[PDB]
A paper describes a structure:
By contrast, in vertebrates the clustered protocadherins (Pcdhs) provide analogous cell-surface diversity, but in this case generated through stochastic alternative promoter choice. Biophysical measurements with domain-deleted proteins showed that Pcdhs also interact in cis, through a membrane-proximal dimer interface involving extracellular cadherin domain 6 (EC6) and potentially EC5. The specificity-determining cell-cell recognition interface of Pcdhs involves domains EC1–4, as shown experimentally through mutagenesis analysis and suggested by mutation correlation analysis.
Crystallization screening of these dimeric γ-Pcdh fragments yielded crystals of γA1EC1–4, γA8EC1–4, γA9EC1–5, γB2EC1–5, and γB7EC1–4, and their structures were determined by molecular replacement. The γB2EC1–5 and γB7EC1–4trans dimer structures show the same overall arrangement as the previously published γB3EC1–4 trans dimer structure. For example, EC2:EC3 interacting residues 111 and 294 in the majority of γB2 orthologs (not including mouse) are lysine and aspartic acid, which are likely to form a salt bridge in the trans homodimer, whilst in γB3 and γB7 residue 111 is a conserved glutamic acid, which in the homodimeric complexes interacts favorably with H/R294 in γB3 or S294 in γB7. However hypothetical heterodimers between γB2 and γB3 or γB7 would juxtapose like charges E111 (γB3/7):D294 (γB2) and K111 (γB2):H/R294 (γB3) which would disfavor the heterophilic interactions (γB7 numbering). (E) Structural alignment of the overlapping EC3–5 regions of the γB2EC1–5 dimer with the γB2EC3–6 structure provides a model for the overall architecture of γB EC1–6 dimers.
Numbering used by the authors:
A (entry chain A): 1 to 526
B (entry chain B): 2 to 527
The structure:
Amino acid sequence: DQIRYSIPEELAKNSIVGNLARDLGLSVQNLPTRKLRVSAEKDYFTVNPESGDLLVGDRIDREQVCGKQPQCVLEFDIVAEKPLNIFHVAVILQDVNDNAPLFKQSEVDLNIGESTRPGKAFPLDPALDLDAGSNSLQKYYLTDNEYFEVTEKETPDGRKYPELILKRFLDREEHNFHQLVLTAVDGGDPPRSGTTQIRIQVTDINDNPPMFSQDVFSVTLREDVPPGFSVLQVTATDQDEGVNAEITYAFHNVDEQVERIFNLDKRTGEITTKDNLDFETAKSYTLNVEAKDPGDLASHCSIQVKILDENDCVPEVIVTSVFTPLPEDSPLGTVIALIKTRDRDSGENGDVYCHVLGNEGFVLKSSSKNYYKLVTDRTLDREAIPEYNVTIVAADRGKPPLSSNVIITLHISDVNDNAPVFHQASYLVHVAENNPPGTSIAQVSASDPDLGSNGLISYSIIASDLEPRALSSFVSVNQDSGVVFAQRAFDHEQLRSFQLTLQARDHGSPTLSANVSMRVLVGDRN
Amino acid sequence: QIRYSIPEELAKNSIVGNLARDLGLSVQNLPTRKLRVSAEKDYFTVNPESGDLLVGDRIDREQVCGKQPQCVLEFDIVAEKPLNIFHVAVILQDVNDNAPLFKQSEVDLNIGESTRPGKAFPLDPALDLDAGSNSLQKYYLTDNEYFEVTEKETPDGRKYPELILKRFLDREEHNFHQLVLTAVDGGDPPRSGTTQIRIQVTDINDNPPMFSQDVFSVTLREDVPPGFSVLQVTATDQDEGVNAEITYAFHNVDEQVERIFNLDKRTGEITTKDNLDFETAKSYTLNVEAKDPGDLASHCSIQVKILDENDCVPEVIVTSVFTPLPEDSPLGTVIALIKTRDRDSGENGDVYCHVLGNEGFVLKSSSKNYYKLVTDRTLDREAIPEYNVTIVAADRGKPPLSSNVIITLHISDVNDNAPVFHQASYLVHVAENNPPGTSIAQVSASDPDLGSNGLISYSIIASDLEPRALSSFVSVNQDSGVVFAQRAFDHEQLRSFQLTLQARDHGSPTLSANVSMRVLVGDRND
Ligand SMILES: *[C@@H]1O[C@H](CO[C@@H]2O[C@@H](C)[C@@H](O)[C@@H](O)[C@@H]2O)[C@@H](O[C@@H]2O[C@H](CO)[C@@H](O[C@@H]3O[C@H](CO)[C@@H](O)[C@H](O)[C@@H]3O)[C@H](O)[C@H]2NC(C)=O)[C@H](O)[C@H]1NC(C)=O
Ligand SMILES: *[C@@H]1O[C@H](CO)[C@@H](O)[C@H](O)[C@H]1NC(C)=O
Ligand SMILES: *[C@@H]1O[C@H](CO)[C@@H](O)[C@H](O)[C@H]1NC(C)=O
Ligand SMILES: *[C@@H]1O[C@H](CO)[C@@H](O)[C@H](O)[C@H]1NC(C)=O
Ligand SMILES: *[C@H]1O[C@H](CO)[C@@H](O)[C@H](O)[C@@H]1O
Ligand SMILES: *[C@H]1O[C@H](CO)[C@@H](O)[C@H](O)[C@@H]1O
Ligand SMILES: *[C@H]1O[C@H](CO)[C@@H](O)[C@H](O)[C@@H]1O
Ligand SMILES: *[C@H]1O[C@H](CO)[C@@H](O)[C@H](O)[C@@H]1O
Ligand SMILES: *[C@H]1O[C@H](CO)[C@@H](O)[C@H](O)[C@@H]1O
Ligand SMILES: *[C@H]1O[C@H](CO)[C@@H](O)[C@H](O)[C@@H]1O
Ligand SMILES: *[C@H]1O[C@H](CO)[C@@H](O)[C@H](O)[C@@H]1O
Ligand SMILES: *[C@H]1O[C@H](CO)[C@@H](O)[C@H](O)[C@@H]1O
Ligand SMILES: *[C@H]1O[C@H](CO)[C@@H](O)[C@H](O)[C@@H]1O
Ligand SMILES: *[C@H]1O[C@H](CO)[C@@H](O)[C@H](O)[C@@H]1O
Ligand SMILES: *[C@H]1O[C@H](CO)[C@@H](O)[C@H](O)[C@@H]1O
Ligand SMILES: [Ca+2]
Ligand SMILES: [Ca+2]
Ligand SMILES: [Ca+2]
Ligand SMILES: [Ca+2]
Ligand SMILES: [Ca+2]
Ligand SMILES: [Ca+2]
Ligand SMILES: [Ca+2]
Ligand SMILES: [Ca+2]
Ligand SMILES: [Ca+2]
Ligand SMILES: [Ca+2]
Ligand SMILES: [Ca+2]
Ligand SMILES: [Ca+2]
Ligand SMILES: [Ca+2]
Ligand SMILES: [Ca+2]
Ligand SMILES: [Ca+2]
Ligand SMILES: [Ca+2]
Ligand SMILES: [Ca+2]
Ligand SMILES: [Ca+2]
Ligand SMILES: [Ca+2]
Ligand SMILES: [Ca+2]
Ligand SMILES: [Ca+2]
Ligand SMILES: [Ca+2]
Ligand SMILES: [Ca+2]
Ligand SMILES: [Ca+2]
Ligand SMILES: [Ca+2]
Ligand SMILES: [Ca+2]
C-alpha cells in the first residue's frame, strides 16, 4: 500500500519530490504534532516537518543502486508518532544518459595464428554502459578495413558480447600486425561513443620453405686438392621465424662415390672433400643438396663440380715385339721391335714424344700417334759389336715433364761372312831322307772369327804335282788338327821336292775356303 | 685401319671377318708369321692357320662404351718375320638387351602439408645402359588427382624426372599416398622399369583446438568448500605432435571470477579457490580459451548458477515503541512498529512473526513483512504495571532459523480510582461535658492510585447545624482523618447531630467521596 513519485536521477539536493501532506490527508497543524520521519537503509531522502513535503537527501546515483534493472524503484518507509503509524513510499527515478559507454582496457593485444580459417570468431570483451533503456549501448562498429569484421553476438540464453569475424587468410610475411579502432555507441540524444584499440600480432606458422639463391651453381677443382678442401658453401633463406625457420642441409640422390668423396655439414651448409680426387677416375661430379625445415618443406639445388687435370701419371713404354737374336747381315730398315706409349693423363700431359738415346745405328720411325718401330740405320757386324744395349726414352709435355726409359738388349747372331785365313802365306818344310812313315812332318793352321760351325775348320789336300793315284801314297793331312803326315819313306835320289796345295774350309752356308801352297824338301843322305 | 661392324653379345668362336684376305697377306705364309692380337683385353683371337678373327670373351657393349652413341673397339695385330703391326676397328652395334631399372624399388618422400602447388620434386632417374632409341625415352605415372610427372633437361643435358603437385595436400584427409612410376625406352618390344613412390605428408599446424560445445551449464550449492571439483573441460586438436598440445586459460573475465576460480592450464579443469555466497553473486559467467602453440584458439563459456542455502538468521527490528503506556489506552491502540529482514531468498528468506503467550497484544500486519503490535485488552496499572512482550520470527526454509526480541512496556498511571471509605457510615458516641479539643472519632479511606493520585485529604463538607457554628462543634485533621470536638457537649441542649464528610484525592482532576457520620451526645447528670 504505497504512493509513487517520479524524478530524474542525480537531482539537486533539497529539491521537492512532492508534498505528502496532501497525499496523506494530514492537516499542517496535525502534522507537527506528529514526528514525520524517513526510515530507509541508506538515507537518500529526508523530510522537513514544518514543510510537510519530501526532500532529496544524499546523492541519488541510479547506476550504483538499481544497476541494470529495467525499472528503478526506491522503497522506503515514513514513520509518524501519536498515533504511531507507518506509511510506505516508493519513488521511480528516470535514467539520465550521463554515463558514456567505455571499454575496460585502453589497448587490447591479440595473438592470432597465421593459418586461422576464415569465418572463425574471436570473442571480444564488451563495453560497459551502465544506463538502461535506449540510453544503454546499442551499436558496435569497427574501422573499415579488408582483413577483419565485427559483429555483436547474443547467445539465445541471454548474455551478449561483440566478436571479430575473420574475413580472409592472414600472412605475417605480408603484414606483421594490424591495429584497429572499435567504437561503441549508445542510442539517445545525443549519442555517446567510447573507443578502444585492438592490436593483432600474427604468429608464425610453417608455410614458406627454404629457398636457394639459384637453381644451379658451379665450381672447379684441381685433382690434387687435399682432403678437407673447402669446395662450396650453400645457404637457403627461410621467410619464417622460430623453429619453422631452422634449415637442414643433406646430400640426397647422389651416386655412391659422390657421397664417399665429399662431405656436407648439415647445419652450416659448406661442402668439403673427404678424400683425394682423381681426374682419370671421374672427370666431374654432380651434386644435389636438399634444404628443409622441420615441417618437411624443402627445396633442392644442384652444384656441378668440374675437375681439372694435372700431370701426375708417368708415361709408360710398352714393347710388344723384339727381334732377337738378330742376324748380322740384316738389310737396312729391318724392323727390330714394336713400341707403343701409354699415358693415362689427358691433353698435353698425355702427349708424348719418343727418342732413342745415342747414335749406334738405331732410329725410331712413327707410323701413327703413340706407335713406333725400331729399325736399323746402318749395317751391322758381330765380330765388331756382338751385343747392344739400346735405351729408349719417352717424355710427356706436362710442366714439369715426367719421363720413362727402357733398355732393350739386342744380341747379334753369327752369319758365315768370314773366310778362313791361313797363318802363313806359304809353307816350306824340310824332311830328311829315310824318314819314318806315318810321322808329323808339318802342321798347317788357320783361324776363323765366326762362331760354331761357321768357324770350325777342316783341312784337305786338293791338288799336287805327283801322280794322282799316288798322292795318298806320299803324304796326307789330318782334317781336324791340320798336321801333315808322311805315308812313305822319302828317297832323295829319286825326288828332292814336291808341291802341295792345302785347303782350309769352314762349315757354313755357303762354305768359305782358302788355298795355301806347301813345298816339301827331301834332305840327302846315303 | 680396317673397319668392321658386328652385334654385341656374340658367342665365342664366331667369325668377325677374314683378315688374311683383308690385310693383303698370303695364306701360304700365314703359319710362319704368328698372327696375334695385342689389345687391353682379350676380346678377340685370330687363328693363324685360317687367318680369321674370332670373338673371345663376351663383348658386352654396355661394359665397354657406356654413354657414347656409337662404339668402336680399336686393337692391334702383330706379325713376325717379317715383323709389322696392323690397326683394326670393330664397330659394336647395339642390341637392346638392357631394360630401364631403378636403384631402389621403393622410394619414401616426406612432403610438408603446405607445399604450394606446382612445387617440383626431383627424383632419382632410371638407368638405361643402351644408347640411341633403345635408351630411355619417356616416364609415366599412376593417374591421380594430386601429382603429375615430368622430365626436365638441365641445359647441361642431364635429364631427371621431377614430380609436380596440383592440389593442396591434407594429412587430416589423406595421411600418405602410394604411386607407381614407370620408365619406357624406344625399342620393340619396349622394356619397362617400375618403382613405387610412397609419399608421406608431414603435419603442419593448420587446425585449431575445438570444444565439444560452445556453452556449458553447471549449478553449485553456495556452501561448497574451497577446492571443489567444479568441472573439467577438454579440447581436441586434429593435428599431431607439438602442433596438438593444448593450453587453456580464462579470457575476458571479471576480477571476482579470477579470485574465486582456479583453472588448470594443462587439464582444462576448474575448481574453486575460495568460498561462495549466494547473496553476493547469484551466477558467474566464465569464458575459457583453448590455444595451441600456433596461437590458434577456440572459445567456450561456462554459465555457472548458484543455489541458495539457508544460512542467514531472520532479524526483527522494532522501529518505534509506545512507552510509557497510559492504562486508559483504548483497544487497537498501536504500541510498537515492527519490520523484518532476511537476506536469504525464497522460502529461506520468507519470515513470519508471532507473540509468545496471551496478555492482550496482537500483531496486525498492515502489509507483507511489516507489523503493528496493537492491544486487544483494556489495561489496568493497579493490576499489571509492567509487560515483557517477547516477539519471535522464523523462516520457512529447511532447516528453519528464528530469532526473538523482548520489548518492555511500562504502564502510565491515570487517576481512575476515587477514594473509598472503609465503612459505609460512621456512628460515634460522645460523653457529656467533654473537654474541647479531644478526639471523638477517626475516619479512614484508601486510594490504590500512584503518588498524588493516591494522596487523600479529608474535610467536613456539610451538616445539619447552622454553618456559622459548625466550626464551633467538630473539626477534622486532613492528614490523619481524626474527628475532634471543638466544644463541650451538653445533652440537654442537643442530644445528637449528623454530619457529612468528604475524602478527596490530590491529582488533577480531583476525585471525591462523601460519607455520613452520626454523632450521639451521651447523657450524664449535670
Ligand atoms: C522483564 O524483564 C527484565 C529483564 O529480564 C532479563 O532477561 C530475562 C530473560 C531474565 O533472564 C532476567 O533475569 C533478566 O534480568 C526484568 O528485569 C530484571 O529483573 C531481575 C530480577 O528482578 C533483576 O535481577 C537483579 O539483578 C541485579 C544486578 O543487575 C542484582 O543486584 C539483583 O539482586 C537481582 O538479581 C535484573 O537486574 C532486572 N534487569 C533489568 C535490566 O532491570 C524484569 O523484572 C521483567 N519484568 C517482568 C514483569 O517480568
Ligand atoms: C748391357 O747392360 C747389362 C746390365 O747392366 C750389362 O750386364 C751388360 O754388360 C751391358 N752390355 C753392353 C754391351 O753394354
Ligand atoms: C783355290 O783352289 C780351288 C781349286 O783349284 C779353286 O777353285 C779356287 O778358285 C782357288 N781359290 C780360292 C780362293 O778358293
Ligand atoms: C459531596 O457533596 C457536595 C455537597 O453536598 C457535592 O457538591 C459533591 O458533588 C458531593 N460529591 C460527589 C462525588 O458527588
Ligand atoms: C562516437 O560517434 C558519435 C557519433 O555517432 C560521436 O558524436 C562521438 O564523438 C564519437 O566519435
Ligand atoms: C579510442 O580510440 C581513439 C582513436 O581512434 C582514441 O583517441 C581514444 O582515446 C580511445 O583510445
Ligand atoms: C670454404 O672456404 C673457402 C675459402 O677457404 C670458400 O671459398 C668456400 O666457399 C667455402 O666456404
Ligand atoms: C726423365 O728423367 C728420368 C729420371 O727422373 C730418366 O730416367 C728418364 O730417362 C728421363 O730423362
Ligand atoms: C808334329 O810334330 C812335328 C815335330 O817334329 C811338328 O813340326 C809338326 O808341326 C807336328 O806338330
Ligand atoms: C612397360 O610399358 C611397355 C609399353 O610401353 C610394355 O610393353 C611393358 O610390358 C611395360 O608394361
Ligand atoms: C614397379 O611396379 C610393378 C607393378 O606395376 C611391380 O611389379 C614392380 O615390382 C615395381 O614395384
Ligand atoms: C572433479 O570431479 C568431478 C566429479 O566428481 C568432475 O565433474 C569434475 O570435472 C572434476 O574432474
Ligand atoms: C525459533 O525457531 C527455531 C526452529 O524453527 C528454533 O531453533 C529457535 O531456537 C527459535 O525457537
Ligand atoms: C482520637 O482518639 C480517640 C481515643 O483517644 C479515638 O477513639 C478516636 O477514634 C480518635 O482516634
Ligand atoms: C485511617 O486510619 C487508619 C489507621 O487507623 C489508616 O490505616 C487508614 O489508611 C486511614 O488513614
Ligand atoms: Ca548517474
Ligand atoms: Ca545514468
Ligand atoms: Ca549511455
Ligand atoms: Ca605466410
Ligand atoms: Ca619454413
Ligand atoms: Ca609464415
Ligand atoms: Ca691421377
Ligand atoms: Ca692426371
Ligand atoms: Ca703424363
Ligand atoms: Ca761380319
Ligand atoms: Ca760372322
Ligand atoms: Ca767362316
Ligand atoms: Ca648388352
Ligand atoms: Ca645393349
Ligand atoms: Ca633398353
Ligand atoms: Ca588440414
Ligand atoms: Ca595439419
Ligand atoms: Ca593444432
Ligand atoms: Ca549465504
Ligand atoms: Ca543464503
Ligand atoms: Ca533465512
Ligand atoms: Ca485502574
Ligand atoms: Ca490508576
Ligand atoms: Ca485517586
Ligand atoms: Ca445531663
Ligand atoms: Ca446539662
